[PDB]
Design a protein around this ligand. Structure first.
Ligand SMILES: NC(=O)c1ccc[n+]([C@@H]2O[C@H](COP(=O)([O-])OP(=O)(O)OC[C@H]3O[C@@H](n4cnc5c(N)ncnc54)[C@H](O)[C@@H]3O)[C@@H](O)[C@H]2O)c1
Ligand SMILES: NC(=O)c1ccc[n+]([C@@H]2O[C@H](COP(=O)([O-])OP(=O)(O)OC[C@H]3O[C@@H](n4cnc5c(N)ncnc54)[C@H](O)[C@@H]3O)[C@@H](O)[C@H]2O)c1
Ligand SMILES: NC(=O)c1ccc[n+]([C@@H]2O[C@H](COP(=O)([O-])OP(=O)(O)OC[C@H]3O[C@@H](n4cnc5c(N)ncnc54)[C@H](O)[C@@H]3O)[C@@H](O)[C@H]2O)c1
Ligand SMILES: NC(=O)c1ccc[n+]([C@@H]2O[C@H](COP(=O)([O-])OP(=O)(O)OC[C@H]3O[C@@H](n4cnc5c(N)ncnc54)[C@H](O)[C@@H]3O)[C@@H](O)[C@H]2O)c1
Ligand SMILES: NC(=O)c1ccc[n+]([C@@H]2O[C@H](COP(=O)([O-])OP(=O)(O)OC[C@H]3O[C@@H](n4cnc5c(N)ncnc54)[C@H](O)[C@@H]3O)[C@@H](O)[C@H]2O)c1
Ligand SMILES: NC(=O)c1ccc[n+]([C@@H]2O[C@H](COP(=O)([O-])OP(=O)(O)OC[C@H]3O[C@@H](n4cnc5c(N)ncnc54)[C@H](O)[C@@H]3O)[C@@H](O)[C@H]2O)c1
Lengths: 551, 551, 543
């Protein structure tokens, strides 16, 4: 293939970095301005122009424009400034862009499967040009974080995540497929817009919904394979959580809100155990929330303790849960699911009405907030922990900052700088009245999903075990330096996400092979060399024909 | 376009003549054996192998194999040995090949239009890949010369003629379209063959036949233009002749059996008038046959005489016709058509029962045989002419040698070497008993159709006048040298058909422009430079990209 | 994809078999004659046309023409008349045709790598249009069996072998790559020919030759993977056998003239054991030849003997070799390689200077001829075997019939119909004075190379063990029925090469999975269903 096609294909387009010889031999001479550049001077130009733009949304439109025209340059400028541009390409900017920029550009991207295509989903899947898709990320657009129901404009979230698959772990873009399932929208802003690109119906919540996602799983699997990695993104939590439980064993799938959160949470708790060398006997965990998030984090804490010598029944006894209906205790008016039973224990002396009460009676070393309510970690609960514990571990993991259980400021000030705090919410540094400044823990799922994804695909793995996320959590905290640990860092620097994501991937690769969860053989001797050599890189390949004299 | 496609396309394939640099830059390196040749050493190889083959049919299969793989090399070896290979590529070999080699190779070529496609002929025409067809040659396969009804195997004749369009006049092959109209076959050899490639029905001879050729003319014209040249080849004579009369004014069409024969005939008569300087007063022409062939030749003789000072009515009076029912005379039991009337005259003293009689009473300077009977120019008729005329002009133009009115041997021997003889049949040299050897006149339609075709296409001409064939006839004989004329040559050497065809084309180009029958403007000042520069040549073009250092 | 390109591509072109629906949908109406046919009608037409062709050369040209126009029709025709057309597409007529087809037609196929292209082999491999090549066959054209050095025209043999890969074992043609390495020709008629299509230089035997082969190995492996099966064919016996040792542990490689020849030989030897049931202790095998052919046959015989209770050194003691300088004995004046050492034994009291004298002293049960020196299984050698053994085994395997150690006639006549005779030559049936008719065994590498290839490709095997060829030999003899063994057959009928090839493939698939040399997972529970449902078939697909 030669001529204009090489320039209109972003996967081949080098733009001005097309060599004079390449331009002349491939029929590009005259179709490009008369100057040869390098990827270095290209990337510099787009950086200079990106830093004249102050709006995150303006940055999003400029960088996503480069993806559509030059793939290798898009992932070079992304990796050159990964900490700054990860929040542009993905969360939080991606949600704000979709809502606003979908109706202005109307540029189709990824594969759209409507409920109207029920019966023939394979025929729609077959229309996708790439024949070796390894990674599928799908949205229905119902629960976009901080916005809500964006319908088909949801497509941007799977696109933005797959960007970080490539940027962070070096997963090949051509092996990636962003999907948006359109079953309607409950947002009348879209239903009443004449220029809406989706289906004009309220969300189908009947058996036809469950049967369409069933058909989509079979369809993707039947074209690309049983080992094809599938992630549900910004789906309704009830749907997202019940689909993990339905497809986890049959298909190669994992969920960031449960399993990524568990791994990131455990990583922070393990990092806290390196500064606070508290013996596992002195450890008692209390959860605000007893749902799929709590169950997932609790499972990985139990499994961590069983590896460190404790018993499953002993580990569980060190974990307490407090839901809407108070503490989970054997013999309670409110219902306890079969999943919540292991962390449901014999009642203590006093039954706590509030969470502040529960803390004072149970005296936990750690409190974890996974109840999407609000500031339930009230100043009184934060002060009680500072009284009971020298260095209290306080994890407010409810992600929409509003729903977070406490702020970094109200955590560090009311614990006079002694608390080990982490959150999913982006709290800035917090300065005490003695003068010392505290930079809080920020658990991001970007630490886990790239590394796990690369390993599973590279190993041709068909099932993702709980232990993958345990091994991912240990791998993340293993990369924190003794200097960083002494500065109170609970998480590696996000600027090093590439080295971090690949080192997690090598350590999960080692686990999958050792526990017969890998189908790629022959098994490599050096799993580090295996992963690092199979990563996709942003360096332009030569498209120049090999011309030589016959000796 | 690069890679294997350049080699599988005969229009681009240079084979071993692909330059090392071309091979390396266009992705051919390794797909060809490791040797670079030239068109010169290529052509030499295929000539050496062709001259180890003695069978004309074996030669046909070998040379048609080169056409399908390398277009430019096919037309180079054809033009290098044009006199020898014209009878292989076209008549007489093409008819013998089609009949025998169609069922062994079953290789589709050209466009097939069946009577079953009535209503949708445009849709079939639209499926032909070339968008600028200038020349269409069509067969129904009914009257293949010396064989008969070959049905769809007829396709070979239009293919073979279009080869000579390119070889003789330099008409572009991509601008040429061979067509075969399948309305059935009356040959039970094909109708009973399970491996027959045509329609299993007797020839449709209803209104559906006439309406299909009508639809085909409109279809070709509606895609390619009103100026698109159309020739009917090896059609039934009744169909071929009535279709010339139906489409001659509406469409750009000419017929070789009438108009090519007339031009070739007149050319020989004009060549005879250069050796025999007989005044036009002493000229009297007698025809055996009064059909479309005779009418066409007679028309061009009249028009030649009117240009040389005689009157249409005087010229006609010098032409007599003798059909199945004897001499055409005013007041005769047998019918005289409105077309035959100008050459139907007041009866002489004696009414001739036989053609021998007619010769003795009329005492013609020239006799022309255009009656598809047999040896009607009997030894007695040939002897009578030798008695009446010093140098008798005897033209036996009935083409299947069997149907020819006399042989070269019986012409020259019974006229003791004084006759100026021509035929369409391939008679070898004839030696008299005094010792002198006579090489007879051989009127071939290849003298006319290439030159006429090139001129008409180059001039964007929509109507082919009788005068085109008059100008073609004068142009042919104008090329005979005074040395050749003294050796009794009535026709130029066939080895020089290229120079001959182009010189006719220049002279017809001049006529069409001067008589407002050309639509290509601006009109060229030098019609020689116009034609010779627009001819397609067998020389390989360079497909090498232009690589140069920037100064 | 649409219109003429579909018809000009042999992989897609169905010809007259293109359905009206397809012609209407793919813009073919008008480009094809009105007739619509079935592959059945097409096949019958080309079968009738080929029966009228007289020369095997003329037949080769006709069928190879169908291969370049309609690939599925070519493989239907070939599989319909496999026994008669295998000698046309491949040995023996492929070598004869290689000369003429090249000069006359000059039509290009396969991948050509020159010593001039050294350092740039990846460029050439990358120019091949197919991305999923699973089977590569390569020649330099030095030892074309029968004709010798045919230079760049030797390309015909790889093209011929890959046709049988597909015809016999249903290996997808688009995953098959024929390669010809041009390092020059020592053939003086070709060097003198102005229309020779190769390098006008003598065969480079310098380090540059060995380096080109290393670069070819790496290039193919770099693009298509380390799994990629590579087969060296009609190479110089020197290079061919030394390249097996070099690459067999690094790459997925096997040589037909050694490992294929060894497997077909053992299979016949195993077939003869089922008839006579000689106690394994009484077995004494004497080779005429101590080349890598004899070494390969011998290695597989000891492996069969070890599988049946014998120790390795006690199996080796039952195998003797006799070459140009006489019997291989410890301390002989003549040279003995390290590979010949296991079958070099302590001198008997009497040392034979003649092979007849070797037969008389050693008293062998089996004589295997692999020398290429002509009729050295002399009447007196054959008479001696008939005297010593009730049912003597005589294998004259030297391929060109004129360099065969004895004839079927000579074998059966001078043994009074008691011998079990196999050859690689096409000897006809032999009728004795007692009225009994003997059909000689004909060993053909086509029994082994298709089945072994499909199995290795399907199992994603990277190293082909000696045991693969022992299991292939066993699988071939298992095909032989009791009536066939009773009728004195040593090899299955070639008419059933497809069934034989797929049954062999299934047994090798089973071995590779059982011995952890198969890298395709998940592992199939039915290894027979796995193979049979992965076979490419001549039936047209709906376009
Ligand atoms: N690049 C191509 O166009 C292409 C396509 C198909 C096959 N091939 C070739 O076929 C052979 C077969 O491949 P293999 O099974 O040995 O691969 P592998 O064993 O190196 O990789 C194991 C699995 O991980 C996948 N993988 C590897 N690198 C990846 C990345 N950066 N992002 C996402 N997924 C990745 C592969 O598709 C495969 O399924 C290879 O040698 C290859 O060169 C090449
Ligand atoms: N905005 C969003 O997009 C969104 C939506 C859902 C969940 N989330 C996040 O994901 C996590 C998982 O939540 P979920 O989907 O399992 O919700 P859920 O309602 O299924 O479970 C949350 C748990 O919190 C408990 N809870 C609720 N209100 C409480 C109160 N006032 N006091 C004590 N306990 C209370 C519930 O009993 C329940 O056990 C949460 O941390 C939440 O921040 C975000
Ligand atoms: N070669 C191509 O791919 C191609 C195709 C279409 C147009 N063109 C360009 O567009 C311009 C328009 O052409 P034009 O009208 O001036 O042509 P023209 O005036 O040179 O020719 C007059 C007519 O004769 C035809 N003709 C010329 N040479 C011929 C040959 N060897 N065989 C058969 N027919 C022949 C032309 O198609 C045209 O209809 C040209 O300058 C040409 O370069 C090129
Ligand atoms: N074999 C073929 O493919 C074939 C077929 C038809 C014509 N041709 C040739 O084309 C030319 C045109 O013929 P046509 O199609 O006009 O045929 P036609 O029958 O239409 O006209 C031929 C003329 O010859 C006359 N004629 C026939 N027999 C005669 C006889 N015994 N004596 C005197 N006159 C006689 C007829 O009256 C008629 O005027 C002929 O010269 C013929 O050789 C060849
Ligand atoms: N089970 C079935 O019914 C069935 C039938 C045909 C194809 N398939 C295909 O098998 C695939 C499974 O993946 P896979 O390709 O890794 O496993 P596979 O078993 O199809 O492949 C085994 C290996 O052998 C090769 N191979 C397979 N068939 C071949 C043939 N006829 N000729 C030459 N080489 C051949 C393949 O390239 C691969 O390297 C599926 O995608 C499916 O399309 C399945
Ligand atoms: N069975 C089959 O289908 C098949 C297939 C391919 C090849 N082959 C045969 O395999 C053979 C391989 O051997 P090669 O010809 O390449 O020679 P080689 O050099 O490989 O070995 C031949 C051996 O025979 C010995 N020898 C030579 N002349 C002798 C004589 N007069 N007396 C005793 N010993 C003598 C040599 O010393 C040498 O050890 C070929 O002859 C070929 O015909 C058979």
């Amino acid at each position: 293939e030669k001529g204009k096609p090489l320039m209109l294909n972003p996967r081949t387009n080098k733009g001005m970095a097309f060599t004079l010889q390449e331009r002349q031999m491939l029929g590009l001479q005259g179709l490009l301005p008369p100057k040869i550049e390098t990827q270095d001077i290209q990337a510099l130009a787009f950086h200079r122009n990106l830093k004249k733009m102050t709006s995150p949304l303006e940055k999003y439109i400029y960088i996503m424009g480069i993806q559509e025209r030059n793939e290798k340059l898009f992932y070079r400028i992304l990796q050159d400034d990964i900490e700054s541009l990860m929040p542009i390409v993905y969360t939080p900017t991606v949600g704000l862009a979709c809502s606003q920029y979908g109706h202005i550009f109307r540029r189709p991207k990824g594969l759209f499967i409507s409920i109207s295509d029920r019966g023939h989903v394979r025929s729609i899947v077959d229309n996708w040009p790439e024949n070796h898709v390894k990674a599928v990320v799908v949205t229905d657009g119902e629960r976009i974080l901080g916005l809500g129901d964006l319908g088909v404009y949801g497509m941007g979230i799977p696109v933005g995540k797959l960007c970080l698959y490539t940027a962070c772990a070096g997963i090949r873009p051509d092996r990636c497929l962003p999907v948006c399932i359109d079953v309607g929208t409950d947002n009348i802003a879209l239903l009443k817009d004449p220029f809406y690109m989706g289906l004009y119906q309220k969300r189908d919540r009947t058996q036809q919904y469950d049967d369409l996602i069933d058909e989509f799983m079979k369809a993707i699997t039947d074209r690309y394979g049983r080992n094809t990695l599938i992630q549900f993104e910004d789906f309704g939590n009830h749907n997202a959580f019940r689909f993990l439980r339905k497809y986890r064993e049959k298909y190669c799938t994992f969920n960031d809100d449960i399993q990524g959160t568990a791994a990131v949470a455990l990583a922070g708790l393990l990092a806290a155990q390196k500064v606070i060398s508290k013996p596992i006997s002195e450890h008692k965990i209390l959860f605000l929330g007893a749902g799929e998030a709590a169950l997932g984090i609790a499972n990985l804490i139990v499994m961590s303790m069983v590896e460190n010598g404790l018993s499953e029944q002993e580990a569980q006894k060190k974990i307490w849960m407090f839901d809407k209906y108070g503490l989970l205790v054997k013999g309670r008016k409110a219902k306890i699911d079969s999943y919540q039973e292991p962390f449901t224990h014999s009642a203590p002396e006093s039954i706590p009405d509030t969470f502040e009460d529960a803390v004072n009676i149970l005296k936990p070393s750690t409190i974890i907030g996974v109840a999407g309510a609000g500031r339930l970690f009230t100043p009184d609960v934060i002060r009680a922990m500072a009284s009971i514990n020298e260095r209290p571990v306080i994890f407010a993991l409810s992600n929409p900052t509003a729903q977070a259980e406490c702020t970094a400021e109200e955590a560090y000030t009311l614990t006079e700088g002694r608390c080990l705090f982490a959150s999913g919410s982006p709290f800035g540094p917090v300065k005490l009245t003695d003068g010392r400044v505290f930079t809080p823990g920020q658990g991001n799922n970007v630490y886990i999903f790239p590394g796990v994804a690369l390993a599973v695909i590279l190993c041709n793995t068909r099932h993702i075990s709980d232990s993958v996320f345990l091994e991912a959590a240990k791998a993340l905290t293993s990369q924190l330096t003794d200097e960083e640990l002494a500065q109170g860092r609970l998480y590696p620097p996000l600027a090093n996400i590439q080295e971090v994501s690949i080192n997690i991937a090598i350590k999960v690769t080692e686990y999958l092979y050792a526990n017969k969860m890998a189908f790629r053989y022959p098994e490599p001797e050096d799993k580090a060399k295996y992963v690092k050599e199979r990563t996709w890189r942003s360096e332009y390949d030569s498209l120049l024909p090999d011309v030589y004299e016959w000796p």
